[PDB]
Amino acid sequence: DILLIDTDERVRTLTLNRPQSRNALSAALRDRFFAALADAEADDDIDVVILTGADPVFCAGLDLKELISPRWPAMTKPVIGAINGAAVTGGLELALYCDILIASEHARFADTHARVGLLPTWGLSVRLPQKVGIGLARRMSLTGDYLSATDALRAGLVTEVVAHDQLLPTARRVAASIVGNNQNAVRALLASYHRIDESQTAAGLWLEACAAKQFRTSGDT
Amino acid sequence: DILLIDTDERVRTLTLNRPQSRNALSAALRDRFFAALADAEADDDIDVVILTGADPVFCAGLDLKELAGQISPRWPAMTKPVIGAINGAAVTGGLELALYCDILIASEHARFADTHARVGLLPTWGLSVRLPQKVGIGLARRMSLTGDYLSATDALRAGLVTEVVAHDQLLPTARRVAASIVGNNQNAVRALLASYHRIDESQTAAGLWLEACAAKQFRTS
Amino acid sequence: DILLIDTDERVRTLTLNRPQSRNALSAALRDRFFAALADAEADDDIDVVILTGADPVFCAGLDLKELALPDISPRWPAMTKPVIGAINGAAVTGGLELALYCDILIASEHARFADTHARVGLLPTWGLSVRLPQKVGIGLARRMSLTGDYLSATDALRAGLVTEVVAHDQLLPTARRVAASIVGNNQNAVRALLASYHRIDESQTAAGLWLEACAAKQFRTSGDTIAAN
Amino acid sequence: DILLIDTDERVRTLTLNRPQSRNALSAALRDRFFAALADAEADDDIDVVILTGADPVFCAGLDLKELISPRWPAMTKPVIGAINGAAVTGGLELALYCDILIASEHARFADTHARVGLLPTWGLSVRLPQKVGIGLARRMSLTGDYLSATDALRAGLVTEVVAHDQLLPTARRVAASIVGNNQNAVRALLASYHRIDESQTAAGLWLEACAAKQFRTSGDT
Amino acid sequence: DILLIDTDERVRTLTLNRPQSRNALSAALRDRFFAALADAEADDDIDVVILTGADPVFCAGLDLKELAGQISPRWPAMTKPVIGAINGAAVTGGLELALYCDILIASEHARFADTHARVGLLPTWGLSVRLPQKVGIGLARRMSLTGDYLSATDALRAGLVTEVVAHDQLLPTARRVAASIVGNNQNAVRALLASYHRIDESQTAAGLWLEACAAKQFRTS
Amino acid sequence: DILLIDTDERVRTLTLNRPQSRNALSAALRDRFFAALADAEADDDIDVVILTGADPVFCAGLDLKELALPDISPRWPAMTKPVIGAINGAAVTGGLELALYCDILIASEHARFADTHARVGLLPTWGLSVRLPQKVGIGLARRMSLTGDYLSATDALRAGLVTEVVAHDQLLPTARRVAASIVGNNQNAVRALLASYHRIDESQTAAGLWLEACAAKQFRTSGDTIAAN
């Protein structure tokens, strides 16, 4: 019940559904989510994944009341992020994993890693400056403040800002455009994009992971 | 005829001229254009090159009708700035032509699109590398997978073009920018741009190689 | 006096104070500025640094009056404390490179950005050819570098060069508000995260920074060679 | 008849067989060779490829009397090079593609690209300094002189130098060691090695290809 | 007991001490060893660290028997040179321990091997990156796929170890090298090594990330 | 006189000629050597350059007698013509870096290699921390750098640092034979290929070279800071 799995015209929709916890990523939810992603990639009759949250929050990150390794699988099928509300810390990283982002007017983005005293391990310190710019990323990370939907459109984090009631329709519309194209070309091309992006981000992703472990180790002392 | 060549105040203007074929890059036009670029680079009496198309289309890409009866990169190393005056639609191969330019200035009528996935080809002129680097990851992947048009204003918002002007002011604006460059220290200008090109390829080389191998691999199947 | 140094609520403000010379970085000012940054990094009572200029100019670059073709090495030290650049006016050439060094930029409505290296006959050595396209985009950086024309505050905003454009008298207060909410954070996590950001950036810009320096060295060598004949 | 295809205990042996042309790589031989490689990778009951030449020459390179693009496919199965004799220019590049090299006492290595007035396009200028050292590679490439089997062992180009009659037995012995191991681990590990090597060589491979095209273009002038 | 710790003339000697388990890295031994390294790095009265094993085995790798009843990298950033005195077999995980050292000196009895493919695991301590970088591509891939032993002299020939000495001269030789380092300007020594480490990771970071992802991906299946 | 310049069969030989000072690179010698290389690159009648030293030493490095902590920028120019290093004797520190700059090394039986940077209290600026491990291996380079001990000609041979070790009186003749068979090649293809080799190497060493320079700048800064107190 914590993850809603929908299939509609070769589009797989994943909805984070723990709204009483701001859709926080518990161990059970993380397990089911990444398994769902792998299930979609293996599924021959699925072409596009849409990622969204149950209103009013997208994902507030990992469950803090409950409590690490990167688990997003290698995919040839596009994941569209439909950000219905606040994407915070761990949830911001989920959004950064996506190929295409689409925001509601009510979407907000924040990185509170430094506030809660933990260092990122899901590529934020690489992908955030990559997709919003260096200056803004450092401002977001160091302050912990919210970025607005309009500011996210101006910075390039999202491709479009739509009225709340048209978030999911807009996402299926883009998804339909992808399903209409040559699938083999689409997947080979996306695979190329991923491969190229991987070549550019790999060194940074390793440096992030080192900084995180060293911070944890230094903390234990 | 298919390529018009003008010289004025140390500025070399190259105009794609197959309006009945939407300035599509035929074998003939390619050989002229790339020979024309080498001509300008070798000419000390030339400091700035302006690339544009005959109205209303900039370049519809490669002539895929000619290929139906029958593509490594050929853009030569240059120390002279190439200004793209995008007068209309720059699609697929024509988009890559635009991506090659150092500076892009758009008409109100200018629009951009990648239809590689519609026609079952993978790019070989740096699109999967230059497009994300110039319009952002999210927007680039949305353009490549849907095949939809990006407008002039959205190209301005995303950083693809440096300016959007009234249609009859397109080339006057381009020649004005050119005049500023022609106004500066040419040794410094050429040494600086050479450094820019040097630094850029130090960052895109690996990606360009991966794009090429993906294309070859895809052609093979 | 040519450099104003203020401390308030764990925030160190550095003000370039040669207004009669448009805050041009003379030899004496470069020595004191880079010394000031090192102090801030070494001072345990400092968490955030604010860099700004005395009105109406932020910084017009190197003092070209007081200097064969001048070769100037980069001196900006490694830091774990964030540096906020409050761009109050014109940031030109060398001053533009000072701004690109900053972690966070906040622009006045009067802020302007320009690169006149090609116009005076020198190649950059403080990271411009690497950082400028990194932060404003490739097309915009090359247009700026080759023309020498000014980039406005609002154009800089949509390009990503600055995070915010505020009314002129709100510039410093905005810079201090951002500083305060950084100061209000976990300082171990802040400095560990910024150190990480710097490391990742360094691993991405190193090759470029070297190629810039070589191109500069190679350009000065020709210039002297030509001049001596 | 120009390529000998052998299958023995899950080991696929490819023998270049145009000894009257020093096993030169004609168009027909290149077509059959790379198809053979792809056939071996797709073959489920094949674990290892052994590459060798018909005595007394390994491969003298491309057929010059007859007359370009890299065609070596992505593989998860190990290719062992059994160098029976002279590996020259194009043939040296074939040897450099292999995962493991084993030399006869009669094996020799030479790069005559500069002598015949053509620039390499199969990774020599990247892989040769990678596997024999920078100083030796530049000496080989600039002079065109032969490298001895013993000097190749001292430089790291080959892993072992055996008596001529034990070249192929030694190769099948190593091949048998690989067939004896966990295949899934072996292939995943080799795939990792290839991926890592690709990240380090991609930028160079693209720069080589550019230098080659620019040399061809400059030649036409 | 499982890890002996000696201090002599500003040299810190770390001796793996589970000879009944062939110095296999159990959970206990790992925690001691990596804590011991952090101790040495923090101690200003220490300039050089010597890593060695209790005869006749250096380190048989991780204790896979302990794991049978139940592995991210943990080697900390150091400005002090770590000398590996390989006294015997350095296998798999123990090989990676050796690969971490700045300087390797081998006994006549020292031998090296990678059995990751025999036991169905993929490396996580940098083997697929450091092994090829230190013994060459061809030799590294032959070692990883066959699981065979590389001898001391062949390790000397390939560049893995800087020297091979008589067995009773192993540690005297190591302390002699250490004494030369202890003899130099320590600020310069530590600044230089820090630069070496910096430059090295600038070249291996991407590869280390790829190794980690390959391991995780392989574990997943 | 401190630099001997010979031309024979399209081969330019450069001989470091300060034997009484172990061919130490003084300010005057550095100026003339790097000027000589540029001439060779510019001379259409030259195809190959040979660098060697007057016996018994190849080069003992920078003249430390004639010089706060000295900062020396890299000056080795971009070249499309191969440079053969005929290592006749000791190549120490700075002289070691001269050798690593060469495309091809040929060692005398008397050739020795050492790095004494750590011993005299300076960090390298001519590419040692990047090129030395690139050409002799990581373990061997670090052992060399941290100890300052000598590497012998034959040990250098098996490590890959030199392509060949010959009898002393055969050194130059060997270097000329290699040169002659380069000269006997297609000179367009030779220079296009070497230019390509250099470009690929540059794209692999740039980041490292920048990190070396920063580490050196950062080390000198501390050294002066400590000394001034």
Side-chain angles (χ1 to χ4, degrees), chain D residues 78 99-100 102 153 159-160 174 177-178 181-182 184-186 188-189 192-194 196-197 199-200, chain E residues 117-118 120 122-123 127-129 132 137-142 144-146 148 157 203 207 210 214 218:
Chain D
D99 297 288
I100 304 169
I102 288 171
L153 187 65
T159 60
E160 189 175 7
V174 172
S177 300
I178 304 182
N181 278 325
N182 187 322
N184 294 332
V186 159
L189 182 55
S192 186
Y193 272 125
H194 286 175
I196 293 170
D197 184 78
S199 72
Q200 295 168 342
Chain E
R118 297 234 215 100
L122 266 63
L127 190 144
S128 54
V129 177
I137 303 281
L139 199 48
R141 293 180 183 178
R142 184 184 165 143
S144 291
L145 299 177
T146 65
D148 296 339
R157 181 206 63 200
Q203 298 163 346
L210 293 172
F218 183 78

Side-chain angles (χ1 to χ4, degrees), chain A residues 47-64 66 68-147:
Chain A
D47 288 337
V48 178
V49 165
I50 297 185
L51 173 60
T52 200
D55 282 326
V57 180
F58 177 72
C59 180
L62 272 52
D63 203 278
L64 297 182
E66 189 177 69
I68 170 66
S69 48
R71 298 175 71 192
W72 192 286
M75 301 182 61
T76 58
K77 307 181 189 178
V79 171
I80 305 172
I83 315 303
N84 57 307
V88 179
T89 313
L92 178 57
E93 296 180 286
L94 278 186
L96 291 174
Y97 271 118
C98 300
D99 297 288
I100 304 169
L101 282 190
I102 288 171
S104 173
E105 40 177 335
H106 295 304
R108 292 178 303 165
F109 306 90
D111 176 30
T112 63
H113 275 108
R115 276 225 205 104
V116 293
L118 204 60
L119 252 60
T121 65
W122 284 4
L124 184 137
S125 52
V126 179
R127 297 194 182 89
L128 188 61
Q130 191 184 37
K131 300 182 183 184
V132 311
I134 305 184
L136 189 60
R138 297 187 185 181
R139 181 167 174 169
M140 290 178 58
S141 300
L142 291 179
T143 59
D145 290 319
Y146 275 118
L147 184 74

Side-chain angles (χ1 to χ4, degrees), chain C residues 131-163:
Chain C
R131 292 191 185 88
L132 184 67
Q134 195 186 27
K135 295 178 179 182
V136 315
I138 293 188
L140 201 37
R142 295 179 187 182
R143 177 172 177 171
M144 286 179 65
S145 292
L146 302 164
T147 63
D149 296 333
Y150 274 102
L151 183 75
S152 72
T154 60
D155 284 344
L157 180 59
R158 68 130 142 79
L161 180 55
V162 297
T163 57

Side-chain angles (χ1 to χ4, degrees), chain F residues 115-198:
Chain F
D115 178 38
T116 62
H117 275 119
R119 191 183 287 168
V120 296
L122 264 143
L123 258 57
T125 62
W126 281 8
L128 190 142
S129 54
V130 176
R131 292 191 185 88
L132 184 67
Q134 195 186 27
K135 295 178 179 182
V136 315
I138 293 188
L140 201 37
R142 295 179 187 182
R143 177 172 177 171
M144 286 179 65
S145 292
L146 302 164
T147 63
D149 296 333
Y150 274 102
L151 183 75
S152 72
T154 60
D155 284 344
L157 180 59
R158 68 130 142 79
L161 180 55
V162 297
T163 57
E164 187 181 356
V165 180
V166 301
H168 188 69
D169 296 339
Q170 301 279 2
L171 173 65
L172 266 299
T174 291
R176 299 190 205 103
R177 219 202 301 105
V178 174
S181 62
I182 294 179
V183 154
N185 245 77
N186 187 341
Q187 290 311 298
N188 284 338
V190 157
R191 291 171 194 174
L193 193 25
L194 185 61
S196 182
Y197 269 125
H198 284 171

